[PDB]
Subunit: 148 residues, 3 copies
């Protein structure tokens, strides 16, 4: 089978008092992510992993973040690929993300037209290390498997 | 042909057990085994290590990895391979790589040739480069 | 079939008086990457992903830290060893993270170099360029990082 893998990375600064939107979920918090778009680091990492798996370049080259993810999926399908699964990790010292993971997974699954059982989102802190551990930013990592 | 991929990340502060090998980190804080565990739960879409094994009292990370592998199996997946990287400025890890690989392979019931561990320094950059923490990354491929 | 995945990571310091070589491309810049070889962080990450997928260890095992080695030659040798182990490469994806210089103008040349070295068509190789949004040592321009993923199949 013509399987392909992709990987994505994104990070943004946390600044006052933008909305904190991750995986399409607005999370109550005193700061939010800084970017030209809504700065949804998780959706950006996933988008990059998908463009990467399909050898379609990157988010910079191509481009709210859910609309961008739906367009990415469209472009991946246009190239003849089907998405098999996505896995991801968010690294944030605060706030607590566990209560929001299920809604993120639902949003992603809806945007990629996947069943829930093919989408995973994990949450981590950075153990108080570095800019992530000081709460200066939030990072996301993603992996995607597609097939032509 | 129902393959799935997963990825994992862990870091801990240095105040030493890595890949089950006593060679320290502040669980037993085994960053490599935690990253692998997260990659496996991610491939099976089972969530994450913090949900499955919440702060198991007294359980070491090899035990947690074996329990993860059991849950992945009960979900209907077989593990095909794992790859990983440890980033530590010190000590030297190369002499311990085979022992780590053998521990992981034993816990996952995989042949040695399906398990890989790599080691890197951070070229003196950041908290990793100053010896303040150790990071691990992992990737896993599974099939239903 | 017998698919395997691998992942790679590399970072090098940026310093005056070195060539900046990324993905085999010599990029004009007043600083370059420091290492034993030409310090091509992108090629090194990809090399690590390939050795990882094949369960062949890591770049340090194979090419011990080569003074000024051409990392394209190292990548070609890595690919030869992966093939001798019985694996065929299916795809490579990667990311480069740098505050400066601008890398987007060079991405296509990097992809072409990687594809030629791995005997792959261009549509199986991807390179993505990022900044680190002003955060950390990467945002201060102290070094450049690369990440890679590879899929192989044991023939
Ligand atoms: Zn972003
Ligand atoms: Zn851990
Ligand atoms: Zn290197």
């Amino acid at each position: 089978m013509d399987f392909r893998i992709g990987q994505g990375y994104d990070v943004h600064q946390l600044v006052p008092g933008r909305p904190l939107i991750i995986g399409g979920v607005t999370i109550p918090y005193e700061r939010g992510l800084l970017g030209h778009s809504d700065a949804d680091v998780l959706l950006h990492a996933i988008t990059d992993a998908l463009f990467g798996a399909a050898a379609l370049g990157d988010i910079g080259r191509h481009f709210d973040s859910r609309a961008l993810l739906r367009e990415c999926a469209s472009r991946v399908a246009q190239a003849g690929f089907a998405i098999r699964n996505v896995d991801s990790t968010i690294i944030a010292q605060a706030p607590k993300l566990a209560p929001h993971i299920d809604a993120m997974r639902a949003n992603i699954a809806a945007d990629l037209d996947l069943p829930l059982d093919r989408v995973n989102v994990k949450a981590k802190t950075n153990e108080k290390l570095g800019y992530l551990g000081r709460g200066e930013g939030i990072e996301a990592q993603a992996a995607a498997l597609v097939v032509r």
